[PDB]
Amino acid sequence: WNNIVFYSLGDVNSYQGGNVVITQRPQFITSWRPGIATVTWNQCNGPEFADGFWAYYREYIAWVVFPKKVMTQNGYPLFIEVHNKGSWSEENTGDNDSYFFLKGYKWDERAFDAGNLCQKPGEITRLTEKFDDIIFKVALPADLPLGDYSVKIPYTSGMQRHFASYLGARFKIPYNVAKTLPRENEMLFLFKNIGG
Ligand SMILES: CC(=O)N[C@H]1[C@H](O[C@H]2[C@@H](O)[C@@H](CO)O[C@H](O[C@@H]3[C@H](O)[C@@H](O)[C@H](O[C@H]4[C@H](O)[C@@H](O)[C@H](O)O[C@@H]4CO)O[C@@H]3CO)[C@@H]2O)O[C@H](CO)[C@H](O)[C@@H]1O
């Protein structure tokens, strides 16, 4: 059997880009913040609870799905580009609308730990793991009005936890499903367009 549960993080953060001109590509840093996660998706055909007497195997993969474009409040498109993905595995690069970053750091790990191996959507748990930052840069359209900007950029980040009854178990949430997961995180990108 295989049980996979996606635990979604949902913090809001700000990044000050300062004064910028439309010929520049201001950057912003997206950091992974340990916190409370909410199940937003699962797929299970195994047992619901492990009572401590039985073994199962863990495969954990961190995910970040980030938009390639975002509209400003006043109606202008900002183009998001990856500047430094750190150790993240940037995949499904052909998608026109979103970046997909994954970090599979645990696999084939046998455990007897008691717990709920298929929490339902809405359930929560605390994620204490830390992952690398991702630095993005933004291209501003030349026709962007001058002034202060506070751009809300929704995105998904979370932990895919896969429990299985056997060794060598592998599962990755399909990109097409991931792209649709609730985007509970928010980067609030601030900057003042002084021209150019
Ligand atoms: C679908 C698939 O399995 N392979 C694709 C691959 O998928 C892996 C990728 O998304 C990474 C990103 O971190 O996470 C998963 O794998 C983890 C580790 O990162 C990876 O190093 C490790 O590999 C070990 C393998 O499992 C062992 O059997 C082997 O003996 O030793 C290897 C190295 O130590 O595996 C884990 C698995 O959880 C994903 O599985 O991504 C690429 C890039 O897109 C491509 O699609 C592959 O087909």
Q: Could you write a compact summary of the structure shown?
A:
By secondary structure, this protein is mainly β. The protein is 2% helix and 57% strand.
Class from helix and strand fractions = mainly beta
Silhouette:
elongated
Largest sheet descriptor: 9 strands, mixed
CATH superfamily placement: Bacterial adhesin receptor binding domain
- Which class in CATH terms? Mainly Beta
Number of helices: 1
List the bound ligands: a molecule of 4 linked components (BGC-GAL-GLA-NGA)
Note the run of SSEs as H and E. Answer: EEEEEEEEEEEEEEHE
Proportion of residues in helical segments: under 10%
Q: What is the CATH topology assignment?
A: Immunoglobulin-like
PDB class: structural protein
Keywords: PaG adhesin, GbO4, Structural Genomics, PSI, Protein Structure Initiative, mcsg, structural protein
Assembly: monomeric
Entry title: binary complex of the papg receptor-binding domain bound to GBO4 receptor
Tell me about this structure.
Belongs to the adhesin PapG family. It is found in: Secreted; Fimbrium. Disulfide bonds join 44-118. Keywords: Disulfide bond, Fimbrium, Secreted, Signal. With 196 residues, the protein is mainly β. The chain has 1 helix and 15 strands; from the N terminus they run E-E-E-E-E-E-E-E-E-E-E-E-E-E-H-E. Strands 1, 2, 4, 6, 9, 10, 12, 14 and 15 form a 9-stranded mixed β-sheet that branches. A 4-stranded antiparallel β-sheet has the order 3-13-8-7, with no helix packed on it. A two-stranded antiparallel ribbon has the order 5-11. Strand 9 (89-91) and strand 10 form a beta hairpin. The longest helix is centred in the last third of the chain and has 4 residues, at 175-178. The chain is elongated. A molecule of 4 linked components (BGC-GAL-GLA-NGA) binds next to strand 6, strand 9 and strand 10.
